[PDB]
Design a protein around this ligand. Structure first.
Ligand SMILES: CN1CCC[C@H](Cn2ccc3ccc(-c4n[nH]c(N)c4C#N)cc32)C1
Ligand SMILES: CN1CCC[C@H](Cn2ccc3ccc(-c4n[nH]c(N)c4C#N)cc32)C1
Lengths: 212, 199
């Protein structure tokens, strides 16, 4: 049973998540994903969420006072506060597994140059905070990271949603002049397993030598 | 100028003038899946439907992108490389993935890239497509160390001060401080980027 709150200035971007949630899991009370517009917590008529960076430089920084109020309302001491950032610790499958048993994730999605660092630093004095990155590329903000994190985590919650895997095949046995490897149709399941292991080994060497 | 075509059995998921993005329902070219030859859990997407779809959508100049957890890593260098392409087609799998012959056949007439966006497991290629699209599009013409922390007003908030150097107006001191924060962060969080063992 997990609650996920996502805070973002683009709530419509989190649409694919609510599109991916089965009725059975929601109705059984296994999962609830709520998305919140950060501007609900702005102080001014212009609904300002950003301001110039101290020390200069390009772009804008998200205001701590707005985020502070949002997190004050949404988080409790039991919350796991997840902050996507390109400077984060790596989000991996081990992370997803660890987080899959949490009662409450709050995902704070930044835009512009990111969120004033005091927001996470203050939050970390009263709850668990995790700054993470989903990979070594640059996005426009945290929303796409949130989509990935939510999917990777929730698919590990029963009933909610190393070597590389080698090639897979299904019908038809011959297609555009390419036959399924005969070993797969041999009924020699020890040989099939060894063939698959070697395919996995080869693929890992070629594509992900960093894993060996 | 870039065209992106995304092919998926879950077009509803993809809802998020120099670039156009089109989403196509794979089922338009039809059951898209069956049990794997050789056994194993789950289902594999049949090559037949994919072949018909890609025949219609792709040309020889197409870069066919296939998200897969067994792919080569998609990185910022990849994003730069793809940013000058005229035409990306992203083939999103579901179930246990797409029959390998789809990529193999396509590779006889266009360039094919099997890639992974990270070391975690998704339910299909759609979220990976959204990530790839976002990372690439922000680099399209006309559109080392980890980033350090950023701060903005007020200079004191909840009794926490913006680091005083950032208020000093000393560009050299600020540059040095920011480099140091980035160094600390990279060593702590991503030591592999500086050629050290991972935790
Ligand atoms: C200062 N920089 C410069 C470039 C653009 C940055 C935009 N941005 C603002 C908030 C924010 C959050 C996450 C991510 C992100 N990028 N790549 C990943 N793997 C991430 C993850 N998790 C990116 C983000 C800000
Ligand atoms: C249990 N099985 C195991 C294999 C994958 C199955 C789901 N699936 C089907 C098609 C497909 C495409 C990409 C991804 C994916 N996962 N993680 C990443 N970095 C990806 C990327 N790019 C996952 C996918 C689920």
């Amino acid at each position: 049973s997990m609650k996920i709150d996502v805070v973002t200035i683009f709530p419509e971007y989190l649409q694919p998540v609510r599109q991916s949630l089965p009725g059975k899991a929601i109705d059984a009370g296994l999962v609830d994903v709520a998305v919140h517009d950060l501007r609900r917590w702005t102080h001014d008529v212009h609904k300002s969420v950003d301001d110039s960076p101290y020390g200069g430089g390009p772009g804008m920084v998200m205001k701590p006072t707005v985020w502070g109020d949002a997190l004050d309302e949404i988080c409790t001491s039991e919350t796991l506060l997840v902050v996507p950032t390109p400077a984060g610790y790596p989000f991996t499958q081990e992370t997803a597994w660890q987080w899959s048993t949490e009662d409450h994730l709050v995902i704070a999605c930044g835009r512009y140059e990111g969120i004033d660092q005091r927001v996470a630093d203050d939050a970390a004095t009263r709850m668990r905070v995790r700054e993470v990155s989903i990979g070594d590329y640059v996005l426009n903000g945290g929303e796409a990271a949130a989509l990935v994190i939510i999917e990777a985590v929730l698919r590990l919650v029963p009933g909610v949603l190393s070597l590389l895997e080698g090639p897979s095949y299904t019908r038809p046995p011959s297609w555009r002049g390419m036959d399924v490897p005969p070993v797969l149709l041999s009924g020699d399941h020890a040989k099939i397993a060894a063939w698959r292991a070697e395919q996995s080994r080869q693929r890992t060497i070629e594509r992900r030598p960093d894993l060996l």
